[PDB]
Amino acid sequence: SLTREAYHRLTPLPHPGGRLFIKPGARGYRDPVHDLLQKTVEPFGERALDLNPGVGWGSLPLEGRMAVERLETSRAAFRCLTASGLQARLALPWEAAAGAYDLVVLALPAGRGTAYVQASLVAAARALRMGGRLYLAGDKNKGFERYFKEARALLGYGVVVRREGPYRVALLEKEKEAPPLPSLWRAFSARILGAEYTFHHLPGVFSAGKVDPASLLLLEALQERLGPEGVRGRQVLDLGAGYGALTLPLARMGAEVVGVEDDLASVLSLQKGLEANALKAQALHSDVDEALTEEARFDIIVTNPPFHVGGAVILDVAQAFVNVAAARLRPGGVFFLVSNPFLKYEPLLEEKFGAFQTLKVAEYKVLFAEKRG
Ligand SMILES: Nc1ncnc2c1ncn2[C@@H]1O[C@H](CSCC[C@H](N)C(=O)O)[C@@H](O)[C@H]1O
């Protein structure tokens, strides 16, 4: 459906008094949680901090009325904030300065998992000065109640200030000293293709604590098709690199790998993973191929695209992955993609490459395609 032009296109949408840029892959718009926040938040003090900005809809009401800092981890969303002219920093929630804010706005990043959420909760508690306030928004169907009560335990006072369907916004006040940030880094050893690796990652990464079965299947298929030395000295693009499940092995195999990842936490995870294993590769914080030059081309492109649990529809970002792969590959170059059995990638590859091959069919399927000039 979406073309590369359309995926990377930044579209400004109107709202009373201004405009806000949104784009495919950027969270925040058409989101009930952020929408309820926008209708609830009001100025308090002089310094505010948004720990889950997205396109900036939730804390927009504070814009122009008090100093507002936005810590964004999504490159896609960051592009939007930048285009909208909204003060924002490429940073993790827990990188927020302690005791420097009067107000904190936080739409619960439930989709990121409990670890990421709790880290954000403590970050908010630490960022606030004693007496500071926190606007916490969420979905009761997505743990709002649990996190709200945990937030209350961390700060003290806290009550719901707005309701709409299962969506909620609570306002809490820091009455007690915040605890230290919990340990954020995790590490686990894994063997891939007969080699040992030690992966390091922060909260919220895909397949935390273990190498994903699908990722392993892709590498197995790749080695069978190209051989153990098949990627040596070759330029490889890893779409959605994560903490490096595919990136590290390929780099160790001698390839010159470029990993593009939209999530900041995942990017830092990849960087430390490479360092810890004495491997070198480009860990780019990028919305698909946004960070690349117009001329950049590759010999091999691999990917374990994002997907919705239990869904049979390919995500826009995933579709973009395929479009970019086809456009970024040099004639004769090869594309490797792994996905659950419920995603209709075949007709997509057929369209973009003209033909494809199924290398493996198990719990997951590994598809292959060669770029024709
Ligand atoms: N717009 C985007 N641009 C780049 N990467 C993205 C993206 N949207 C999602 N991703 C990342 O794509 C990865 C898909 S999950 C797989 C991760 C890793 N390749 C592995 O095999 O373990 C995740 O890291 C997800 O955060």
Side-chain angles (χ1 to χ4, degrees), residues 36-48:
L36 196 56
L37 255 187
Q38 193 276 324
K39 300 175 181 172
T40 307
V41 304
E42 53 181 296
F44 182 64
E46 298 156 51
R47 299 160 176 169

PDB file of all heavy atoms in Angstrom, residues 36-48:
ATOM      1  N   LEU A  36      -6.734  11.767  25.787  1.00  0.00           N
ATOM      2  CA  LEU A  36      -7.324  12.089  27.080  1.00  0.00           C
ATOM      3  C   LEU A  36      -6.372  13.017  27.831  1.00  0.00           C
ATOM      4  O   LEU A  36      -6.803  13.945  28.522  1.00  0.00           O
ATOM      5  CB  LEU A  36      -7.583  10.813  27.885  1.00  0.00           C
ATOM      6  CG  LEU A  36      -8.526  10.967  29.084  1.00  0.00           C
ATOM      7  CD1 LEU A  36      -9.860  11.540  28.615  1.00  0.00           C
ATOM      8  CD2 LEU A  36      -8.741   9.620  29.757  1.00  0.00           C
ATOM      9  N   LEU A  37      -5.073  12.766  27.687  1.00  0.00           N
ATOM     10  CA  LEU A  37      -4.058  13.596  28.336  1.00  0.00           C
ATOM     11  C   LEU A  37      -4.182  15.037  27.866  1.00  0.00           C
ATOM     12  O   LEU A  37      -4.188  15.972  28.667  1.00  0.00           O
ATOM     13  CB  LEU A  37      -2.654  13.096  27.999  1.00  0.00           C
ATOM     14  CG  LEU A  37      -1.877  12.326  29.062  1.00  0.00           C
ATOM     15  CD1 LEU A  37      -0.462  12.084  28.553  1.00  0.00           C
ATOM     16  CD2 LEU A  37      -1.840  13.113  30.370  1.00  0.00           C
ATOM     17  N   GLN A  38      -4.273  15.196  26.551  1.00  0.00           N
ATOM     18  CA  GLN A  38      -4.385  16.498  25.912  1.00  0.00           C
ATOM     19  C   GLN A  38      -5.571  17.292  26.465  1.00  0.00           C
ATOM     20  O   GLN A  38      -5.501  18.513  26.597  1.00  0.00           O
ATOM     21  CB  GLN A  38      -4.519  16.290  24.399  1.00  0.00           C
ATOM     22  CG  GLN A  38      -4.339  17.526  23.528  1.00  0.00           C
ATOM     23  CD  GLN A  38      -5.608  18.338  23.392  1.00  0.00           C
ATOM     24  OE1 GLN A  38      -6.707  17.786  23.339  1.00  0.00           O
ATOM     25  NE2 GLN A  38      -5.464  19.657  23.315  1.00  0.00           N
ATOM     26  N   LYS A  39      -6.650  16.592  26.802  1.00  0.00           N
ATOM     27  CA  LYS A  39      -7.849  17.233  27.339  1.00  0.00           C
ATOM     28  C   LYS A  39      -7.780  17.416  28.851  1.00  0.00           C
ATOM     29  O   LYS A  39      -8.652  18.058  29.439  1.00  0.00           O
ATOM     30  CB  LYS A  39      -9.090  16.391  27.024  1.00  0.00           C
ATOM     31  CG  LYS A  39      -9.372  16.164  25.549  1.00  0.00           C
ATOM     32  CD  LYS A  39     -10.560  15.223  25.384  1.00  0.00           C
ATOM     33  CE  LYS A  39     -10.869  14.951  23.921  1.00  0.00           C
ATOM     34  NZ  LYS A  39     -11.909  13.895  23.753  1.00  0.00           N
ATOM     35  N   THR A  40      -6.752  16.858  29.481  1.00  0.00           N
ATOM     36  CA  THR A  40      -6.629  16.933  30.933  1.00  0.00           C
ATOM     37  C   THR A  40      -5.498  17.787  31.497  1.00  0.00           C
ATOM     38  O   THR A  40      -5.703  18.546  32.441  1.00  0.00           O
ATOM     39  CB  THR A  40      -6.490  15.518  31.539  1.00  0.00           C
ATOM     40  OG1 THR A  40      -7.568  14.693  31.086  1.00  0.00           O
ATOM     41  CG2 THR A  40      -6.523  15.582  33.061  1.00  0.00           C
ATOM     42  N   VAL A  41      -4.305  17.660  30.927  1.00  0.00           N
ATOM     43  CA  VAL A  41      -3.154  18.407  31.421  1.00  0.00           C
ATOM     44  C   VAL A  41      -3.311  19.926  31.413  1.00  0.00           C
ATOM     45  O   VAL A  41      -3.871  20.507  30.483  1.00  0.00           O
ATOM     46  CB  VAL A  41      -1.878  18.056  30.622  1.00  0.00           C
ATOM     47  CG1 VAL A  41      -1.631  16.554  30.666  1.00  0.00           C
ATOM     48  CG2 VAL A  41      -2.015  18.537  29.190  1.00  0.00           C
ATOM     49  N   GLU A  42      -2.805  20.553  32.469  1.00  0.00           N
ATOM     50  CA  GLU A  42      -2.823  21.999  32.612  1.00  0.00           C
ATOM     51  C   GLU A  42      -1.496  22.392  33.256  1.00  0.00           C
ATOM     52  O   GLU A  42      -0.879  21.590  33.959  1.00  0.00           O
ATOM     53  CB  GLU A  42      -4.016  22.454  33.466  1.00  0.00           C
ATOM     54  CG  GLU A  42      -4.151  21.798  34.819  1.00  0.00           C
ATOM     55  CD  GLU A  42      -5.368  22.302  35.575  1.00  0.00           C
ATOM     56  OE1 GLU A  42      -5.411  23.508  35.902  1.00  0.00           O
ATOM     57  OE2 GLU A  42      -6.283  21.491  35.834  1.00  0.00           O
ATOM     58  N   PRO A  43      -1.026  23.625  33.007  1.00  0.00           N
ATOM     59  CA  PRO A  43       0.239  24.124  33.554  1.00  0.00           C
ATOM     60  C   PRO A  43       0.376  24.110  35.076  1.00  0.00           C
ATOM     61  O   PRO A  43      -0.572  24.398  35.802  1.00  0.00           O
ATOM     62  CB  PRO A  43       0.318  25.540  32.986  1.00  0.00           C
ATOM     63  CG  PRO A  43      -0.413  25.418  31.685  1.00  0.00           C
ATOM     64  CD  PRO A  43      -1.617  24.608  32.083  1.00  0.00           C
ATOM     65  N   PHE A  44       1.574  23.768  35.540  1.00  0.00           N
ATOM     66  CA  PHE A  44       1.885  23.734  36.964  1.00  0.00           C
ATOM     67  C   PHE A  44       3.376  24.000  37.118  1.00  0.00           C
ATOM     68  O   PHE A  44       4.205  23.208  36.671  1.00  0.00           O
ATOM     69  CB  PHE A  44       1.546  22.371  37.576  1.00  0.00           C
ATOM     70  CG  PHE A  44       1.814  22.294  39.055  1.00  0.00           C
ATOM     71  CD1 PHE A  44       1.110  23.102  39.944  1.00  0.00           C
ATOM     72  CD2 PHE A  44       2.788  21.437  39.558  1.00  0.00           C
ATOM     73  CE1 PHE A  44       1.373  23.060  41.314  1.00  0.00           C
ATOM     74  CE2 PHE A  44       3.061  21.386  40.926  1.00  0.00           C
ATOM     75  CZ  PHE A  44       2.351  22.201  41.805  1.00  0.00           C
ATOM     76  N   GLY A  45       3.719  25.121  37.739  1.00  0.00           N
ATOM     77  CA  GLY A  45       5.121  25.444  37.920  1.00  0.00           C
ATOM     78  C   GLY A  45       5.734  26.083  36.688  1.00  0.00           C
ATOM     79  O   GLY A  45       5.030  26.697  35.886  1.00  0.00           O
ATOM     80  N   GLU A  46       7.045  25.923  36.529  1.00  0.00           N
ATOM     81  CA  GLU A  46       7.763  26.512  35.406  1.00  0.00           C
ATOM     82  C   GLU A  46       8.411  25.498  34.460  1.00  0.00           C
ATOM     83  O   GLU A  46       8.525  25.753  33.262  1.00  0.00           O
ATOM     84  CB  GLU A  46       8.832  27.469  35.941  1.00  0.00           C
ATOM     85  CG  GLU A  46       8.262  28.640  36.725  1.00  0.00           C
ATOM     86  CD  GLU A  46       9.259  29.225  37.704  1.00  0.00           C
ATOM     87  OE1 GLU A  46      10.399  29.529  37.290  1.00  0.00           O
ATOM     88  OE2 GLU A  46       8.903  29.384  38.891  1.00  0.00           O
ATOM     89  N   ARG A  47       8.826  24.350  34.990  1.00  0.00           N
ATOM     90  CA  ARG A  47       9.490  23.324  34.184  1.00  0.00           C
ATOM     91  C   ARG A  47       8.714  22.009  34.100  1.00  0.00           C
ATOM     92  O   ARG A  47       8.405  21.395  35.122  1.00  0.00           O
ATOM     93  CB  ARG A  47      10.887  23.058  34.750  1.00  0.00           C
ATOM     94  CG  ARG A  47      11.792  24.276  34.734  1.00  0.00           C
ATOM     95  CD  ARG A  47      12.934  24.127  35.719  1.00  0.00           C
ATOM     96  NE  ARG A  47      13.868  25.246  35.637  1.00  0.00           N
ATOM     97  CZ  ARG A  47      14.837  25.480  36.515  1.00  0.00           C
ATOM     98  NH1 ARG A  47      15.004  24.673  37.555  1.00  0.00           N
ATOM     99  NH2 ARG A  47      15.644  26.520  36.356  1.00  0.00           N
ATOM    100  N   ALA A  48       8.409  21.582  32.877  1.00  0.00           N
ATOM    101  CA  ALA A  48       7.673  20.341  32.649  1.00  0.00           C
ATOM    102  C   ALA A  48       8.498  19.348  31.836  1.00  0.00           C
ATOM    103  O   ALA A  48       9.373  19.736  31.058  1.00  0.00           O
ATOM    104  CB  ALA A  48       6.363  20.632  31.934  1.00  0.00           C
TER     105      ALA A  48
END
